[PDB]
Write a protein that binds this ligand. Structure first.
Ligand code: MG
Ligand code: ZN
Ligand code: ZN
Ligand code: ZN
Lengths: 248, 123, 493, 82, 128, 48, 171
DNA sequence: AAGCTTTATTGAGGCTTAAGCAGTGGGTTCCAGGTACT
DNA sequence: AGTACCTAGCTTAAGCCTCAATAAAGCTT
RNA sequence: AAAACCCAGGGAACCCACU
């Protein structure tokens, strides 16, 4: 991905592990309801969304991308877990933005949801891992930030922005700048000794992790062998491992 | 028995070994600390290439040797009369000066003693 | 000094040509005397040769004008009577002997072959893989001369040919048969004749390293004793074949000479008796000097002793920042930083110079513009203590200086940090508490190493990279490594 | 390669900044002219950091592409990391 | 190894370009003039004014226009730069003298044409 | 020896070649080279 | 022969001498350090015509100065083997003949001087002349000499002339 | 002559052997002995 | 007699030993 | 006799400690 290992944090993918109805209930941003729009947005913005159908079409299109993203994540993560490392802690910065701008989220918010969709799309263009314009670089850029963009859309969708976050227009503008600035700081620096860093990153834990933590049974019948010798058998390709095994 | 005055020692360009122009060993002979292999690896990981060069060459054993440009073997140089000739080649004009540690010069020397030519080309 | 300063872009490894070795040698007549010195003075042509290098301090080289420090040493050569193959290249020699025709000295593989052209097409730049393909291809032939494959077996060290008659095979026989392989013929086997030629693998002239390699302290080196055996036996062969020609003393002394030169390179021959000295200690050969963990590559080139370093026990101290280390005064009064004289600090540095050494904040070395050092601990005349812009002052380290602070074993990159120097009275390294966790040093008698970056440029390199605030978060597990020590943690809870 | 084909990262990464600071403080310590108006300092490293914040270091950095090519970025042209 | 009598030159002086005594004289005089101006500059080397006086004493073409005429006259004949420069500097008067001073001119040009070239040189030689 | 027997070369593009040869390795803070600007030196004033 | 070639040399600039005008300092450095010098390969460095190219300034790692590769047109002269060159006689000796070609001192020994061209110290100027007193080579004369060989010592070249071949001697 | 049989034949499975095996200080002992010749 | 001169396991490639298809060679009907 | 001791020219093996 081209991201250095210092400026990343454990984050939770909200798009992963809802039900289909739960996913739609939490992300679709149903614009048909009157009172919900009245409570969340200011009245000038409420009639703007209700009157125009182009905005409604765009809000439907971004949800289409989320279902596409939801399928992609489930293919990437067959296991039902979402604890993944990503550079920008989006939830914290949103919470950071809330306290900076004194949201008072009881009042209806005042940012146009079309600004959220347009701001996210512009932000995704600004986050560049691979330069160039040819489709080979475009695919690499898409694949480099595929996971981050899915998480970026999920946390900064129109429904959660107007319902559970309720940032302001200036706060959202600050949020986009902060995310862009922090993502550029997490880019791997050309010239980092990754090989030396990775080698120490594996050998340092090798001292702490026991030579024979597997003296005990481990799996009741199997002798897992996990330990320095198991690490050794992987570092040098041993054609005669101490305990070969299968998982049928 | 492990008191601190028996263990404290510092050094700045103290006595230098005779086999290779490196610092002594042990504080009894005013020896210096050894910047071992893992220390070199850690300074690579830090990316502090200039500090690594300083430690391993400038602060340990700086040395210079004259090598002719054609053949990668060290030549003979009279710095008093400024005569720089490579016996075997006799070029006397295409000869270069390099700054390389005395340990590396020694190593190349017994490599030549093994009939091996570490021909250094500066071009 | 007239030679331009250059950097080594590439180094090419090849065997020394015997003709090349002779001409580069400084011992023109060759080492013909087993003696070390003659009547208290170095004997020309002996083991210690004045042309070879500088013998003692306050002396000059006879080849160059070296002062025992600027003299790199000059090689000599030993024209031994009968050619000898030496160890190491023997395994490669045997493979070459298999590939080449024993009698016709031909490639034995008929390079006019699409199989070999396929191999050459595959082998563009890999010499060892090219030689492998051919060795497997060589198999068995007897192909052109007829009955020309003698199985070449190696008994002990000496290798002997054996048809299905067995005869011990002379090293000079190897030299004669490698003389015939052509240039492109060598390129098929993966040796460039411009750099490596098979006939050069047989050592027909032995290089003796200069005095810089083997030292003398009156007392001779272990390598010197072995070279004494080489020239003692070499002179024996030279006189035996000069007039004796017994054809049997030669048959044994050549083997004895072969053993000695072989052991000089590699001591631990697996099946051959280790060489011995009069003291009873096995002699350290050149290969033994390099292969060990205490050898040259690892023990001297990779990890070496360094000046400007201190080592003492650490004691905890919570009254200073995490980037500050409390070094003792005596260490600070013995460790110097080279500060450049500029008009900004010319007055401050002048104040340090007049203090001199043993006046803690002062200095001990002052360097002129031409690299001339003047000591300050011996009180020279005040006339040369003047300072102008351009001088160097090696002043004792003061507060705020940057040091590298590491603990063996250095496992990860947080085992070696840069700290700011604080001067405290007692004779220990006072460092902060949260720095313990990355170091794994629990003050139970642990002693620490402190390195000082001597140049100004490397000082900024550490300050922008190796300061402890800049590696609070690890890259291995994207989490902080400093943390809070136990006593603060329990008290804050 | 011209400025149209200038593909390296516009940000001054930490190794480049660390070496620029060292090589500029070394020059300042050797009586090089100072690019920025100093308010009175003796440590040349602080002067180099001040120049870094002023983006007035008279150094062009040559970034070697792994293929053999190289780009020439100005210090003022590079975006400072901090 | 080198011999200009049959035009054997080292590989280094293959792209070299020759100059006249008068061309060198005028170039050195211009450089001396710029040395007179552009203050805070020390005097030039001993070789500088040594060669300047050497080429001023042996100057044969007092005019830069004469220099241009000699070049436009001599370049279009098949002459090597060394032969052309030596002919224009030594200024022989007889074809035998020109062939003896420069033995690499044997058969390059007809002796009548060579004598005509020498007569042209003498015509454009700035007399004193 | 095997490199010497095969006449091998070494581009020294790695790290430890420069380390043992004592020259600066291309391992970060040294992966690049620095060029002194000509124009920016004109804009700087001389300190007293 | 007086040659106009392009030569490459590296100039070293300390930061103390950077100044507001940097390239003029490099020009002065080049105009000082190669002028009047002599190389065994290219001969006498007579003058630098025009500084052609100034290369990129590579700051030496660790050490302070910057490095400038410089290409420049230069007027040079190198003596050859086998050419007749005009010369000015500086001294006539019983052993040889001291002649001058620009900055180069040339020694024409008498054994390489024909038998007719004899030495006479009886004349007020010690000079070379024949018995017919037709060719008189004395102090401050304009002659032509046949360069046989050149020797370089202490970074300058001196040569040996001869008068064996025809049309050699006083002009 | 197409097929069977033999016989090298040639690539493909089984046995010994080097060669490596984390970092810095402090003390002790030993480095010729044996003959030979005055 | 004193002294100077001579003489504990490991692993893995790697070379080495043996064994079964197979086409050339010559019989075979 | 700059007697600028600007302050070691010994190595090897073994054992014992500390992390
Ligand atoms: Mg401890
Ligand atoms: Zn040479
Ligand atoms: Zn020497
Ligand atoms: Zn044959």
């Amino acid at each position: 991905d081209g991201l250095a290992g210092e400026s990343v944090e454990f984050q939770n993918l909200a798009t992963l592990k809802p039900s289909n109805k739960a996913f739609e209930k939490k992300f679709r941003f149903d614009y048909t309801n009157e009172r919900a729009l009245r409570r969340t947005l200011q009245e000038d913005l409420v009639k703007d969304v209700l009157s125009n159908a182009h905005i409604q079409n765009e809000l439907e299109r971004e949800f289409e991308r989320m279902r596409e993203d939801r399928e992609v994540l489930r293919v990437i993560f067959p296991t039902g877990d979402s604890k993944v490392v990503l550079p920008c802690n989006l939830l914290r910065m949103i919470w950071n933005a809330q306290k900076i701008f004194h949201i008072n989220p009881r009042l209806p918010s005042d940012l146009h949801p079309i600004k959220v969709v347009e701001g996210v799309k512009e932000l995704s263009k600004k986050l560049v891992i691979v330069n160039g314009d040819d489709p080979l670089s475009r695919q690499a850029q898409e694949n480099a930030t595929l996971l981050f963009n899915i998480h970026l859309r999920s946390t900064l969708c129109s429904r959660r922005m107007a319902e559970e976050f309720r940032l302001s227009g200036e706060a959202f503008d600050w949020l986009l700048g902060e995310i862009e600035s922090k993502f550029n700081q997490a880019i791997a620096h050309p010239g980092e000794m990754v090989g030396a860093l990775a080698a120490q990153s594996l050998g340092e834990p090798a001292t702490q992790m026991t030579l024979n933590t597997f003296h005990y049974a481990g799996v009741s019948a199997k002798n897992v062998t996990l330990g320095v010798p198991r690490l050794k058998e992987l570092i040098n390709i041993s054609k005669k491992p101490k305990t070969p095994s299968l998982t049928v | 028995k492990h008191m601190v005055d028996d263990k404290i020692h510092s050094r700045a360009r103290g006595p230098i070994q005779i086999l290779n122009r490196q610092p002594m060993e042990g504080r009894s002979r005013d020896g210096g600390l050894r910047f071992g292999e893992m220390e070199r690896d850690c300074q690579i990981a830090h990316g502090a290439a200039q500090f690594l060069r300083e430690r391993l060459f400038e602060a340990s054993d700086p040395y210079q040797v004259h090598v002719c440009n054609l053949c990668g073997i060290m030549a003979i140089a009279n710095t008093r009369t400024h005569t720089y000739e490579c016996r075997g080649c006799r070029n006397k004009t295409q000869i270069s000066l390099v700054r390389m540690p005395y340990a590396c010069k020694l190593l190349f020397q017994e490599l030549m003693s093994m009939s091996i030519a570490p021909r250094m080309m500066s071009v | 000094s007239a030679c331009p300063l250059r950097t080594i872009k590439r180094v090419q490894f090849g065997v020394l040509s015997p003709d090349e070795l002779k001409r580069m040698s400084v011992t023109e007549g060759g080492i013909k005397y087993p003696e070390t010195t003659e009547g208290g003075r170095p004997k020309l042509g002996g083991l210690m040769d004045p042309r070879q290098g500088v013998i003692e301090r306050t002396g000059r080289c006879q080849t160059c004008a070296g002062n025992m420090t600027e003299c790199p040493g000059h090689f000599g050569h030993i024209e031994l009577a009968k050619p000898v193959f030496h160890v190491g290249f023997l395994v490669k020699t045997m493979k070459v002997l298999r590939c080449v025709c024993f009698f016709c000295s031909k490639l034995l593989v008929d390079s006019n072959n699409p199989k070999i052209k396929d191999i050459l097409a595959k082998s563009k730049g890999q010499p060892k893989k090219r030689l492998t393909h051919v060795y497997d291809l060589c198999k068995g032939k007897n192909g052109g001369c007829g009955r020309y494959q003698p199985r070449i077996r190696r008994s002990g060290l000496e290798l002997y040919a054996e048809w299905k008659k067995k005869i011990l095979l002379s090293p000079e026989r190897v030299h004669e048969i490698f003389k015939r392989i052509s240039d492109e013929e060598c390129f098929v086997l993966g040796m460039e004749p411009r750099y490596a030629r098979p006939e050069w693998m047989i050592v027909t002239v032995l290089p003796v390293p200069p005095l810089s390699v083997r030292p003398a302290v009156r007392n001779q080196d272990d390598l010197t004793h072995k070279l004494a055996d080489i020239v003692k036996i070499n002179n024996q062969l030279r006189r035996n074949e000069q007039n004796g020609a017994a054809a049997h003393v030669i048959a044994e002394d050549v083997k004895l000479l072969q053993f000695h030169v072989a052991t000089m390179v590699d001591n631990e021959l697996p099946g051959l008796p280790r060489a011995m000295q009069k003291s009873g200690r096995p002699l350290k050969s050149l290969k033994q000097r390099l292969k060990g963990k205490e050898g040259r590559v690892r023990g001297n080139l990779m990890g070496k002793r360094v000046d400007f370093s201190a080592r003492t026990v650490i004691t905890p101290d919570p009254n200073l920042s995490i980037d500050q280390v409390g070094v003792p005064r005596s260490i600070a009064a013995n460790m110097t930083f080279a500060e450049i004289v500029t008009p900004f600090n010319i007055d401050r540095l002048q104040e340090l110079v007049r203090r001199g050494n043993s006046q803690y904040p002062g200095a001990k070395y002052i360097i002129r513009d031409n690299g001339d050092r003047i000591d300050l601990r011996f009180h020279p005349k005040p006339s040369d203590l003047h300072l102008q812009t351009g001088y160097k002052v090696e002043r004792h380290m003061c507060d705020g200086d940057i040091v590298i602070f590491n603990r063996q074993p250095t496992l990860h990159k947080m085992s070696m940090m840069g700290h700011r120097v604080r001067i405290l009275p007692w004779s220990t390294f006072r460092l902060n508490l949260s720095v313990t966790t990355p170091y794994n040093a629990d003050f139970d008698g642990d002693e620490m190493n402190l390195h000082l970056p001597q140049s100004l440029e490397t000082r900024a390199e550490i300050q922008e990279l190796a300061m402890v605030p800049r590696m609070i978060v690890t890259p291995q597990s994207n989490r902080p490594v400093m943390g809070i020590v136990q006593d603060t943690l329990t008290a804050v809870r | 390669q011209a400025n149209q084909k200038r593909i390296t990262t516009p940000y001054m990464t930490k190794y480049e900044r660390a070496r620029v600071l060292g090589t500029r403080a070394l020059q300042i310590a050797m009586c090089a002219p100072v690019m920025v108006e100093l308010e009175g300092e003796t440590d040349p490293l602080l002067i180099a950091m001040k120049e870094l914040k002023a983006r007035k270091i008279p150094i062009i950095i040559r970034r070697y592409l792994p293929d053999g090519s190289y780009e020439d970025w100005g210090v003022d042209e590079l975006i400072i990391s901090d | 190894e080198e011999d200009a009598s049959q035009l054997i030159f080292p590989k280094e002086f293959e792209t070299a370009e020759t100059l006249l005594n008068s061309e060198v004289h005028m170039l050195l005089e211009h450089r001396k003039q710029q040395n007179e101006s552009a203050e805070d500059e020390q005097e030039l080397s001993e070789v500088f004014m040594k060669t300047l006086n050497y080429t001023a004493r042996f100057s044969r073409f007092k005019n830069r226009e004469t220099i241009a005429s000699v070049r436009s006259l001599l370049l279009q004949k098949k002459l090597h730069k060394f032969e052309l420069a030596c002919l224009a500097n030594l200024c022989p008067e007889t074809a035998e003298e020109s062939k003896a001073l420069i033995p690499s001119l044997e058969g390059r040009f007809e002796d009548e044409e060579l004598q005509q070239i020498l007569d042209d040189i003498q015509t454009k030689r700035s007399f004193q | 020896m095997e490199a010497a027997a095969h006449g091998e070369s070494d581009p020294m593009k790695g790290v430890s070649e420069n380390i043992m040869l004592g020259q600066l390795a291309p391992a970060g803070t040294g992966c690049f080279d620095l060029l002194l600007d000509a124009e920016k030196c004109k804009y700087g004033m001389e300190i007293p | 022969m007086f040659y106009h070639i392009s030569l490459e040399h590296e100039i070293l600039l300390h930061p103390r001498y950077f100044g507001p005008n940097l390239l003029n300092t490099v020009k002065q450095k080049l105009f000082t350090e190669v002028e009047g010098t002599c190389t065994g390969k290219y001969g006498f460095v007579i003058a630098v015509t025009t500084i052609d190219n100034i290369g990129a300034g590579v700051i030496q790692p660790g050490r302070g100065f910057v490095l400038y590769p410089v290409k420049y047109k230069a007027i040079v002269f190198r003596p050859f083997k086998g050419e007749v060159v005009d010369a000015v006689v500086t001294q006539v000796n019983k052993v040889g003949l001291f002649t001058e070609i620009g900055p180069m001192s040339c020694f024409i020994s008498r054994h390489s001087i024909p038998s007719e061209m004899e030495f006479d110290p009886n004349s007020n100027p010690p000079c070379y002349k024949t018995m017919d007193e037709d060719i008189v080579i004395q102090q401050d004369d304009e002659i032509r000499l046949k360069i046989v060989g050149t020797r370089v010592d202490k970074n300058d070249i001196f040569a040996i002339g001869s008068l064996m071949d025809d049309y050699l001697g006083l002009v």
